[PDB]
């Protein structure tokens, strides 16, 4: 029974890896030869937003490319403006130990997930103007790692226990339990068409899922340690994942295999947050060492550094229109680079 | 100028928000955050009840000092993955059940847990207020059976004072560094009201440490 099923599972794994090797005819490094490199890229600190007073864990640009949402070690979730560095809203949340920042595409809701296995949805544009608790999503057994927004009605939440979830906003109950994983879950970034999203494993398993069906489609491996952050390519066909192995690894959804690794001998510190830029040419990835790095998705050759913080870059995000990128580290300051 | 009138009203709102943030941070820094931990089936609920989902935060003030107490032991996940979020706690209230010595074994599991926690890179300078529970039951069990079963290197006999001293020194020696931090131990039982007094004293000692560090008088 158990022996037969495990051995046929091993045979299936050998078959799938052999078939992947059959598909891998020429690597991306060989594919992109005689192409003009982007050259050295230097971006200065346009703004330093100093509202916060403690560690910054997450940050998410808005669809308008105008507002910033920044969690913090303290119970503050102060929402920022970019051009005029004001504090549009200051949210005094209750579960101070937060690690998520979700901004609704319509700009009406902002969500945060504390360490207490609770994802809290916050209303922004309401009568009697002040931020109010829209809903307190509960049902998980582990801490919420990252949260996104399908729309104002649905939210996808990664959790400490090995299960993601697609929630319902009106009724607190979750409609689909995404427990087809093993280990822990860290990152998730949806496609531009909001159809498929991936999962950031704690055991090097980037799992693509289907929002409507409710099961995996393509299981990915290739790292030797936990993978921390994931961000989709702007087409929504590929994504690169940043593990604790100091390696950025770029996948695809039509070969289910690696395209190229981003590992430098100098860097031993892992990736905390990764976020692509528009056209996906650049690959912005935060780092545990007090520095952030700029890569190229087609050629592993490294672009200019993005440094200036005093603590590890715990979050990173690029504007939807792509004008600029903001960096949030454990120093209270958040730097926006253009 | 060259700012709109509503833009100036918005910068006034931003200044008000910053002022509220400053007030909140000033009233939060003076608060003391004590990270509670422990081993499996520890008396964390008991020690919480003696004073006054995931985390169960505890609010209570003693001698004009609002304390933060966080029974994180009920999480059931990978510690080294979120324990970085707890950097900067004033102290780590450790919980070790004395009487569970004969019970892989609970004492050595807790010793490995303590070694990791005290030697974690995030808690390089945060003092640990170690607690030992059920002294009377531990004494009864030591009188019943010798402690040598748990400790193959034990050299003493079956007496309360020597057994307590042995386990205390064994736990204290576990620190790789002892100059940056300190380990405060209190043998506590069910009928020990002085626990809040010892917690207060240890918090005063550690906060004297922190203030002297901050002032640069070091």
């Amino acid at each position: 029974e158990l022996d037969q099923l495990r051995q046929e599972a091993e045979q299936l794994k050998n078959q799938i890896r052999d078939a992947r090797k059959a598909c891998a005819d020429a690597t991306l490094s060989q594919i992109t030869n005689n192409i003009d490199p982007v050259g050295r890229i230097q971006m200065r600190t346009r703004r330093t937003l100093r509202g916060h007073l403690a560690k910054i864990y997450a940050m998410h640009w808005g669809t308008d490319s105008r507002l910033l949402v920044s969690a913090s070690q303290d119970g503050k979730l102060i929402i920022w403006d970019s051009y005029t560095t004001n504090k549009v809203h200051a949210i005094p949340l209750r579960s101070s130990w937060v690690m998520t920042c979700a901004y609704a595409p319509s700009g009406n809701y902002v969500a945060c997930g504390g360490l207490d296995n609770i994802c809290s949805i916050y209303n922004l544009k309401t009568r009697e103007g002040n931020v109010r608790v829209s809903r307190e999503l509960a049902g998980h057994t582990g801490y919420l790692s990252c949260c996104r927004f399908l729309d104002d009605n649905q939210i996808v939440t990664s959790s400490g226990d090995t299960t993601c979830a697609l929630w319902d906003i009106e009724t607190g109950q979750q409609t689909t339990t995404f427990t087809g994983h093993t280990g822990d879950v860290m990152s998730l970034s949806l496609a531009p068409d909001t159809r498929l999203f991936v999962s950031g494993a704690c055991d090097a398993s980037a799992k693509l899922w289907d929002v409507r069906e409710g099961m995996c489609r393509q299981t990915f491996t290739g790292h030797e340690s936990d993978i921390n952050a994931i961000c989709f390519f702007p087409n929504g066909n590929a994504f690169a994942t940043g593990s604790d192995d100091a390696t950025c690894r770029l996948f695809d959804l039509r070969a289910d295999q690696e395209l190229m690794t981003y590992s430098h001998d100098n860097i031993i510190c892992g990736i905390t947050s990764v976020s692509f830029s528009k056209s996906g040419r650049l690959l912005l990835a935060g780092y545990d060492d007090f520095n952030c790095n700029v890569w190229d998705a087609l050629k592993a050759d490294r672009a200019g550094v993005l440094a200036g913080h005093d603590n590890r870059v715990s979050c990173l995000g690029v504007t939807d229109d792509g004008m600029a990128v903001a960096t949030g580290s454990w120093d209270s300051f958040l730097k926006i680079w253009n | 100028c060259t700012l709109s009138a509503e833009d100036k009203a918005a910068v006034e709102r931003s200044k008000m928000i910053d002022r509220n943030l400053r007030e909140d941070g000033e009233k939060a820094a003076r608060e003391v955050k004590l990270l509670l931990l422990g081993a499996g089936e520890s008396g964390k609920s008991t020690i919480v009840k003696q004073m006054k989902t995931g985390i169960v935060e505890t609010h209570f003030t003693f001698k004009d000092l609002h304390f933060k107490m966080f029974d994180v032991g009920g999480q059931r996940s990978e510690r080294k993955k979120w324990i970085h979020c707890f950097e900067g706690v004033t102290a780590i209230i450790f919980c070790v059940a004395l009487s569970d010595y004969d019970l892989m074994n609970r004492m050595h599991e807790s010793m490995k847990l303590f070694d990791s926690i005290c030697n974690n890179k995030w808690f390089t300078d945060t003092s640990i207020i170690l607690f030992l529970n059920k002294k009377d039951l531990f004494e009864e069990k030591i009188k019943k059976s010798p402690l040598t079963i748990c400790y193959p290197e034990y050299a003493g006999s079956n007496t309360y004072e020597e057994a307590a001293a042995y386990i205390q020194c064994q736990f204290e020696d576990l620190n790789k560094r002892k100059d940056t931090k300190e380990i405060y131990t209190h043998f506590t039982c069910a009928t020990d009201t002085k626990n809040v007094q010892f917690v207060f004293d240890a918090v005063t000692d550690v906060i004297i440490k922190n203030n002297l560090k901050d002032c640069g008088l070091f």
Partner: single-chain antibody
Amino acid sequence: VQLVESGGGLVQPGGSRKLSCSASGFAFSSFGMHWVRQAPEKGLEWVAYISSGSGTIYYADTVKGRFTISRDDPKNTLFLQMTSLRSEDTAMYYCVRSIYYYGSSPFDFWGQGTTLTVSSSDIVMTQATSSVPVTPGESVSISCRSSKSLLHSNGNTYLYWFLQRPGQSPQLLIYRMSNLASGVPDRFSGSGSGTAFTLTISRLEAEDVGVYYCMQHLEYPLTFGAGTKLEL
């Protein structure tokens, strides 16, 4: 989110009276309140300004010095003390609440207010027509022209469109040109460039008839245009 005001009445000229408004059901402290007064047969004009935390206080040129306005956040009431009463002062005062931030809708709710009666360098808002005849179900366009360009460097115009009903307090329509407010149907729309502005109403319901209003917010006299009635 009701706003109710108290005080006022028949006062001998030159007297002193207290005009206070009560706020309930909404966060008073964050909001910056306003006072706008209307004569029985005249259009509205701005009077006073207060900010969150009482940091910033502004008055109209005519009412400068004579009035004093102070908000009490714990009391949840804003009160205005009234001095040197004249024939230009007799009117009905409107309680206005506004919040200023990116994407905000300032001047969105207006209280019922109370009436005060007595014995008896500013940019101009002009309206081409008043009491314009209109047919239900058609499209009507009303022009409000500003002497000063309202586009500013930020690229956003600052004309606010307000709608008044017979016997009803005004409500916000266009919190910034081509931006529609909450609780307002999609028929109303706004468009304009430079200084020449207009408000386009795709279809007219029986309820949405009355005097329309336009103002500015670049600078602080907060001028209003002479209202335009809509005639069936």
